[PDB]
């Protein structure tokens, strides 16, 4: 992996220590030829939260365009999910977005849809 990335199971990961809005975080990863982390499995989920706890951390999952999509094209419906109970609930807001449309990993690792303008830590992921 490149300098200051973490190699794990054929992927390289970069963990921020500061926050961006979801789309700014995804744009940052794309400029690193990466994407916001796409969590493909329980094993990857455990790896991610070991490193991100206890901050809400953006991952590459969003329903901004009308349904749940992973930023790298991974099929959402059929694949690994780790939603917290009663999530996603699409909570309606105003100041940080009209509705919760971007996914964060909670301290317990479970996923929550949140407002896309929340300034959270993020993780980039690309293949080694």
């Amino acid at each position: 992996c490149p300098v200051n990335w973490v190699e794990h199971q054929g992927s390289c990961y970069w963990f921020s220590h500061s926050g961006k809005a979801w789309a700014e975080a995804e744009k940052y990863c794309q400029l690193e030829n990466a994407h916001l982390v796409v969590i493909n499995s329980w094993e990857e989920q455990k790896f991610i939260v070991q490193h991100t706890n206890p901050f809400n951390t953006w991952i590459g999952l969003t329903d901004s365009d009308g349904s749940w999509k992973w930023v790298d094209g991974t099929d959402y419906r059929h694949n690994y999910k780790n939603w917290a109970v009663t999530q996603p609930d699409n909570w309606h807001g105003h100041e940080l977005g009209g509705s919760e449309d971007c996914v964060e990993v909670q301290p317990d690792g479970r996923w929550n849809d949140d407002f896309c303008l929340q300034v959270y830590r993020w993780v980039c992921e690309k293949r080694r």
Partner: antibody, heavy 118, light 108 residues
Framework: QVQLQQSGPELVRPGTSVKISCKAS????????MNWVKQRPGQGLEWIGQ????????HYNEMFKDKATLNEDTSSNTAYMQLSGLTSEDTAVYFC???????????WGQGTTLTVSS | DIQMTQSPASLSASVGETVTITCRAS??????LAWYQQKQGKSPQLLVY???TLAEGVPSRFSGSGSGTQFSLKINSLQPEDFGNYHC?????????FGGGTKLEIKR
């Protein structure tokens, strides 16, 4: 070359608190876990906890949750462990050691001897 | 919470002999097992991780094996720098735990 340099020996009284440092060089401090291990005289090793400096994420052995607090100074590549409410059972050598997730402790500091005694 | 059990507690051997020390985990840890060497008064040094992978610069005479709950470290044709204490440690889910150690002692 990878090197982990720990602070020098400590001799303190019970009920006090001590801070042990471990300065890392020769690798990217931010991308590895820093682990802390305890070894009482003549005994085996005990894992205290670990910190991931890039995020500050910490994981502790619950046996040490009240005893040890880990933190990091990113600007100086230094990991710290605070040991508090000290008693003679804290007398031991303490090591820092580097690891990656789900991997071994691949480089160790030289150890810091802590003696707690009235 | 995983208990690691090492045996024997002490093993006497001579240079050039082959020895095997063993480690048992109280539950499945797959291949997430490391072995350390520790010489008196010094810090441990990683020998083996992922149960069988030699760490950088470790001599090929060291051989780790096992998965699941039963593991072994074998030292083929021991050299004088091999005497000291050996420790196993699972590196599965935190908290890590260590075996109680095995002293490799000089036979006479």
């Amino acid at each position: 070359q990878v090197q982990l340099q720990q602070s020098g020996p400590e001799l303190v009284r019970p009920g006090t608190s001590v801070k042990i440092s471990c300065k890392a060089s020769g690798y990217t401090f931010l991308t590895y876990w820093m682990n802390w291990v305890k070894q009482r005289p003549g005994q085996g090793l005990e894992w205290i906890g670990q910190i991931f400096p890039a995020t500050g994420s910490t994981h502790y052995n619950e046996m040490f949750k009240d005893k040890a607090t880990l933190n990091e100074d990113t600007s100086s590549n230094t990991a710290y462990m605070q040991l508090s409410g000290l008693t003679s059972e804290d007398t031991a050598v303490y090591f820092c050691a580097r690891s990656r997730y789900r991997n071994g402790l691949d480089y160790w500091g030289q150890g810091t001897t802590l003696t707690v005694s009235s | 919470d995983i208990q690691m059990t090492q045996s024997p507690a002490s093993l006497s051997a001579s240079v050039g002999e082959t020895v095997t020390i063993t480690c048992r985990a109280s539950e499945n840890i797959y291949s997430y097992l490391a072995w350390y060497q520790q010489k008196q008064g010094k810090s441990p040094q990683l020998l083996v991780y992922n149960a069988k992978t030699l760490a950088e610069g470790v001599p090929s005479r060291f051989s780790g094996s096992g998965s699941g709950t039963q593991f072994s470290l074998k030292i083929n044709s021991l050299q004088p720098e091999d005497f000291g204490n050996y420790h196993c440690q699972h590196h599965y889910d935190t908290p890590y735990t260590f075996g109680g150690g095995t002293k490799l002692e000089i036979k006479r």
